[model samples]
Target: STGSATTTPIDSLDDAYITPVQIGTPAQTLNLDFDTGSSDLWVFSSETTASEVDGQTIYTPSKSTTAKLLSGATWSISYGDGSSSSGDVYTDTVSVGGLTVTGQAVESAKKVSSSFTEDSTIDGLLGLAFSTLNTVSPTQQKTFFDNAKASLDSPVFTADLGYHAPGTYNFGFIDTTAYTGSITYTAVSTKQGFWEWTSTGYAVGSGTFKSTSIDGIADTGTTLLYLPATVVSAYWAQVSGAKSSSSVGGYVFPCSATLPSFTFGVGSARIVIPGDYIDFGPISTGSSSCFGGIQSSAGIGINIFGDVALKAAFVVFNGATTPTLGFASK
Candidate 1:
């Protein structure tokens, strides 16, 4: 079987992408951040602290006839940005697009951090990463993709994220019209439980392609592109007056700076990110300095080809017996 869902940018900054999901028998719909970087399908439910609830929808397991308590089971998750949430577990029917999974673990939040409480865009997260990273104790639960992969015509899903527009996430089958030219595939290393792969090299604008290998993950949850310091510095160097600001945080430059495009190689295939995408936005509300969308991954342990890069290409997460990744220009 095959299913497709529409994902929209939650804010004007393209901070994150969210997709609607139906949980339990009564089908309570919630907008969830589809995170490929983590493994835990958690939500803000009636069990959440009253003070922590804001302008977000809450899942009410008590209203769903099929909802069953996973007694003694609990889960907790922390994100890279220090935001966190913890909750107890329940089993119910979960549906994404038209695909359904019975007895899927629906984590109900009991505690949430300030960052999560302050953000009114997302109710919870629908983890699409490997189940090996699941936070559920005692016995780990599989992701929505993992649970439905067996029933799919093909054990694969595709991400087509747009700049400020809505994109579609397709499961089971690939939409050939979603991309241009041909698709380039590479072997994936799931040892770290991420959709990790290595790029052949990169080029600064129209410059020559540097012969090097860069490792990173295709994280839809992340908003910016992070690369090695050397590469990041090279790109910024091309923009005159660009500096790594301490007060502003991250690389910033004059708002009028003529930014150059960025290109990364997947095998011999090159994907190019336009200059406008790199110019992120102004540092502050009315500031003349802008923050770069591309930053250094010096201390992050691993580089990340987040939305900044992914938006320029069509990504395929092939969860076959031996997982692999496919990329194509859109």
Candidate 2:
């Protein structure tokens, strides 16, 4: 079996990406953020405290005939950014695109942090990370993809994240036409429950490619690209009037400054991120200072190839027994 689904950027800054998912027998649909950094298919629901619901859509298990409570099961997750959620569990039919899972675990949010509640654009999050990262207790549950992988034509999924337009998540098979040039394959280390890999090197604009081993995670859930302070500083140095600001908490430059594109190497393949893509947005509402999409990952402990990098290429998250990652120009 194969499945394809559209992943839409919810805002101009591409703050988050949302994909439509169907749940339960009655098929209640919700726009969920397709988060690769976490591993829990959690959602706002009837069980959530009314005050914490906000404007996001809710998944009501009570209305679905096929929904069954996973008694004694509970889950809680806190992200690197400090947002968190906890909830009860239920088993129900879950479908993404046309791929279906007979009994996928659906974590109904009983409590969500203000960050999630305030973001009305997404109903909740559909985690695409390894099932080992799942937070369910008493008995952990498999993710939607994990349960459906055996039935898929191929045990792989590709993420085609876009800039402003809607992108696609293709499962079971690769869409040859979605990318240009041959895909460069690299080894992945899932010991940390992330799709982590080491890049060959990087280049700032037209500068020479620096040979260095940069380890990072391909995290669609994260909003920006984070690299070592040295690499990040090198890239920022090329931009005129760019400076790291303690007040802004990152490097910022004049909004109208001419920005240079960034390139990273995957084996011998080079993926380029346009200069404009690096100009995140105004530092404040209407402020002339703008945030750089690439930031120092020093304190983060791990480099993150977030949307800022993923949006520039077609990424393949291959889930074979020995997992690997693939990158192609798009």
Candidate 3:
């Protein structure tokens, strides 16, 4: 599902749709999306008709003086949300921050649907999640990370999202100051695209986890933390006078006062979800009630930690080092 537009910027917005990058001899611009669900980077090109390219940003390779088309191969991508786009293939030097990677395989879309064509503000998406689910192929497809991984400075890529301002999503290296030295790292299973783990239990107001043995997963694609019914009910029972409301999907309560602090433990490392995130915005469901952070999704067998969870810590994908995953700080 497409997220609320509130997450992006809305100024004069010229720079809003454009991301400046230093690719080889000249600086080039690429459209980016922080898509946790997929691992690919695509853009628009001059071959597209004016009707298909209505409000989208089209990249002119001929004008770039340093752009190369990838033969005659055409590509198309269909998202889980049922949205898709068709484009031609091209190779260009791409860069972000201080790192510049050359010969990056990029797809330039020539035709887009109403969902993509209607949005003048969002030009493209930059996938920063993982490589296990990447759509890489010998005959027709390649990934941005697949090409850049060999040239990355640290053999790792880290993302830091700014909490207060324009959340900076950085690539290449990790900023060590964001986390404590004692980080509990989990080895990723070779099969699933999702990051799976076991949560001991839930905690409130600094309380420790009780059960100490339950499996879960960390998914940035999801928007909320879906917990088991027993765990959700047990945690909400602790809140003084917490009530149940049918307004939203989850159990909700009043937000007149400060709520309790909760944390999820992955091994020995404890990650906390702040109280503000629990409070549903006024525009959400026409009420001022604070939404419960943990909701009932029993029998689902998966716990998705969405962008809300990702914003709290720095995430590192170490695909360069033998296809493994790593988590570090900004």
Candidate 4:
């Protein structure tokens, strides 16, 4: 038998997924964003200024019978989108999908950015990446998975993210029944505290596959797939009237545009992103102006294989040895 967790998409604007986590003795349940991009479990809490809390729920450590304050400990984190949060620390009993972890360092937020205050219903975030990425001071914290993996049947987990739908984050064991075909395995580099991989190349539309090296992370928190500007330009080049617009943020095209499919190479495996998903959605209310679901990753130094690209395949994050990724059509 193995432990596991469920990650379901919320009605939030960020195409993000939330999972239930229990903290403290009596268990203060929190709907936390299960983020693969960042390593911090900071949540909006009683310490957060009233003006900064907004409509989001806050975690109250004082009410938790088992919550213990971590003296002088603190943490801070910022996203690529510039959203940030900071807080003090607590050592508590934390559980997710039936997996229990003791004394896990949880950051209770005292401050949060406007984006986070307004954008999510998630009480906080549960970092699923490497614990080394944890932002605590003096001593870093370990992620829930890091503390619980020693007890798991197989040090592995799989993500099945759906488009505007519910998905599962299976821990310890792979439910071979969830996907089709074989799981394409690829090596990972952990130097950056991300599930970083190098895509040998890619192809736009149904055209010839281009040979190029694209380094990036598998970021589930991001809403779109991001590649090099040159690559992005080449993609929209196949579409008529597609161009970058500052006012609109990224490339905008007519809503009636017929998009072609895009494919990414991971070793010998080819993960495809259909064009229907290429149209991110309308840029404004009641308008034909639509934003490209795929954007430029230029200047960021790496591309991000966000949800737009990730949903196309079933992803496995292996921790038994060198972190490796296994992908298959979902």
Candidate 5:
């Protein structure tokens, strides 16, 4: 999470956009969100204001100097988080890791909230987690991946999160060789979003405490791990000097040296969270002394293992051949 050094501040009211992946060749550009929480590639249009574009990576059709926008379809989206935006649909050429696809679907939002405007580093999220969380309805229209499937070199697409330091956030593709073993795959449940599960338990502090042996969903869009209170408390218990500190809203230790290493279980795979994550204090100014992990959620029901958990492993979302997820070392 905080340890990776890359800090992408998520403003509460910012607008999230999606870029277009073109078919045939790379010549055009579209601004989009690569969201693991949703399976759609959309962007906003000229009607959107510059102020609303703040913090968001806006795809300028004029700047690309070669991109074209489709004039017919108008689009809008509402996220589970309660934020919404709207724009007209367009088609353009796009590229990722030397791979190009043309005529990808794109949505341009006319109105964006402050949350989307605040995080300027991320243009849009690349949804590489699963298809169950797809916002785009297959009955209504084909999703970005649905259209780009035939253009890819392989049936699978992998996200290799490169090391981004404290001030920078870099998103890109990964080379397959960084990991060992065949990619572990899991089927996707066609419920709400790309909701897939892994029969793995997460461990904190040198196996001092084991998380509830439950299903884990790999999410690329979420920034933090939303663990159950019980698991959070158990993790704090293992830290030598960790104590619940009101100032930090959770646990804090007197000395960084007293912290322990945390590992996540993905079936037989154990993903170890570096101690630096525990060593790095919270991001807020008031409770900067506490560790970043094990935060209080005010009794939220589900636990979300965010970017911190993802950085420890290489995540593969196989939607082409079969609906599955693969996890390996980064």
Candidate 6:
């Protein structure tokens, strides 16, 4: 049987999708963000302070006969968005889709940031990057994919991140019918434990295409499309009232602004995100301005093909041999 799983939109707005993951014995189910950006499977736990719990479904490892501490092992991680978590470690049986990984390192949160409390939809994150990026100190831990890949029918997984619809994350299986046309495959550098690739070039709307090589990573944990400052400026300049506001964060424009489609090149493979998706909705309620779906990746060091970019196409995180990324239109 194929190892596959489905993720549904958490809210009516479809900001993110949550994967049903079972951790520990008898299987305590928790919905988590399957992030390809970082490593380590962490979840809110009974150890979290009551103040930090805030309606989150806490994972009680004691209930799982298979959950065992790794003896003094601990983990701490800070996301690119400034959110973070730190906790002790437990070796447990974890399952995603139909793939089961025994002795998986499950990070049980002892301390969580305020964002975790506010965003109750995400109980924790399941990292899909290389095991080298695992955050546990003294000794790094392997991800669920790492432990299960060797036995998979095919050492691969595909991310079908949806727009205003539900998306599926398939493990060790690829549904050929999930994409349209042919899959454009590109070699990636796992040196930094990211799905890093160098783009051939990119074009804005119907403007001239630049042929410079852009190095970046495909990051599911992020929400927006982060490009270089030079690129972001050029795109917004075409918009009538777009402004780069420090206080507002990134570029913001009038709600009525009309934006052309933005396209990013991937080694002769084209992935175009529609304007409707690039609007990124409004900055906040009762506010006339909206945050751009694309921002400057200047300080961040690399362009992050987040939900805004990835949702435009079907993605294949191929790990069979010599890690590669495959993309195709939906």
Model 2 per-residue lDDT at 321 = 94
**Model 4: CA > 4 A from native:** 12-14
**Tens-place lDDT digits, model 4, residues 6-93:** 7777763336777778888788888888777778887778898788876776778898888899999999888898889988999889
Q: In order, what lDDT does every prediction score?
A: 0.93, 0.94, 0.56, 0.84, 0.53, 0.87
> By TM-score, how accurate is candidate 4?
0.95
- Model 1 TM-score, 2 decimals: 0.98
lDDT of 6 by residue, 215-249 (tens): 88988778888998988898889888999999988
Evaluation by TM-score, superior candidate among 1 and 3: 1
Per-candidate clashes come to: 0, 0, 8, 0, 50, 0
Better candidate by lDDT, 5 or 6:
6
* Rank list by lDDT: 2, 1, 6, 4, 3, 5
> Top model by lDDT, which number?
2
lDDT pick, better of 4 and 6 = 6
lDDT of 2: 0.94
For residue 188, what is the lDDT in candidate 5? 58
Q: Per-residue lDDT tens digits of candidate 3, residues 1-330?
A: 001111333222111222344433355554455565565566656776578666656667777656787776666677644667777766777666555556766667777777667666556655544555544344444455555665665555544433433454445555566565544565655356545556655586667666565555455434456777776677677666566555555677666657666676655666676655444443255666656656666645565555455545666655654444444333
State the TM-score for model 3. 0.73
Residue runs of model 6 more than 4 Å from their true location after superposition: 12-14
Following a full C-alpha superposition, what root-mean-square deviation does model 1 have from the true structure? Answer: 0.9
* Clash pairs, model 2 backbone: none
After superposing candidate 2 on the true structure, give the runs of residues whose Cα lies further than 4 Å from its correct spot: none
- The regions of model 1 sitting more than 4 angstroms off are none
Question: What's the C-alpha lDDT at position 54 in model 6?
Answer: 75
